[model samples]
Target: SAVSVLAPNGRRHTVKVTPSTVLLQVLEDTCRRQDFNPSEYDLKFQRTVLDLSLQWRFANLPNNAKLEMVPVSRSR
Candidate 1:
């Protein structure tokens, strides 16, 4: 499965991933390739920000899900 991540600047990037993949890993990888610092942002699904400590499987991520990456200091 894959997920579409919306950057804070409004750019969208698709990541090929599995449910078992760790959420932090995807966020970090996305940040690396997209040229952002993973630690400076938070990931959200729908309108809810996700917990970095959880895995996608347990985090309730859906296939081809649309998510957002926002700066940590930004308000939802």
Candidate 2:
């Protein structure tokens, strides 16, 4: 599968990542681990949310936060 993250300059970076990684988490973790801030880039998940959950809560992601798990292949 193809996963991409956009930079402040509007450049997309594609990196091979595990399936269980969430889009938001991936962006945040990458910034912290690499000593960079991702605030300039936008985070978009593979899917869209239209349910009862709060959109603002789920959509709020910082550039230096931790990563969360998402749907992906199961690996041991």
Candidate 3:
């Protein structure tokens, strides 16, 4: 599946990311591509609660392929 990552500037960056892409690596790559610090903002991804669970950890990632990004949640 295709993965989309949101940049700190609000512009979306979509890539045909492979499963080898790690959470930390994604952050580093995103920062490197967009010129931002990995420590700046919290990142998450939203698709299906099934595809991605809230408890999803970096180690839980698939060995061949996976897509992920930090998401922003709003409180009503």
Candidate 4:
């Protein structure tokens, strides 16, 4: 299935995934493609930021799901 990951800047990145695909793997690739810092962001669907370690099959991710990529709020 395909999913759209919307960056904070509103540019969407599309990726094809299988049932075993890990969410963190998607985040890493997304960051690399855009040259963003993987350490600084989180992938969210709707209002909930997802657990990147989870597999795509485990989440309620439907085909053409829209995921939001947001910067992680880090504390000093």
What does candidate 2's lDDT look like per residue over 1-76, in tens digits?
Answer: 3344444454445544444445445545665675544333334443432111213245433333222223222211
Compared with the true structure, the alpha-carbon lDDT of candidate 1 equals 0.69
Order the candidates by TM-score, highest first. 1, 4, 3, 2
lDDT of 1 by residue, 1-76 (tens): 6777777686677777778888678766766676766466767888556545657778767788667767773334
- Candidate 1 off by > 4 Å: 73-76
> What is the Cα-based lDDT of residue 10 in candidate 1?
66
Question: Which candidate number maximizes lDDT?
Answer: 1
- Listed per model in order, the count of residue pairs whose N, CA or C atoms clash below 3 Å is 0, 0, 8, 0
Assess candidate 4 and give its TM-score to the true structure. 0.71
lDDT of 3 by residue, 1-76 (tens): 3455545565666654444444455555656786755344454444422122222343343332233434333211
- The alpha-carbon lDDT assigned to residue 18 of candidate 4 equals 61
Quote the positional error of residue 68 for candidate 4 in Å.
0.9
The alpha-carbon deviation from the true structure for residue 65 of candidate 1, after best TM-score superposition, in angstroms, is 1.8
CA-only RMSD, every prediction: 2.7, 12.5, 6.7, 3.1
Tens digits of per-residue lDDT, candidate 4, 1-76, equal 7777777776767777665688767766765776766457667787545546646778767687677777774211
| TM-scores of all predicted structures | 0.75, 0.36, 0.46, 0.71
lDDT of each: 0.69, 0.39, 0.44, 0.67
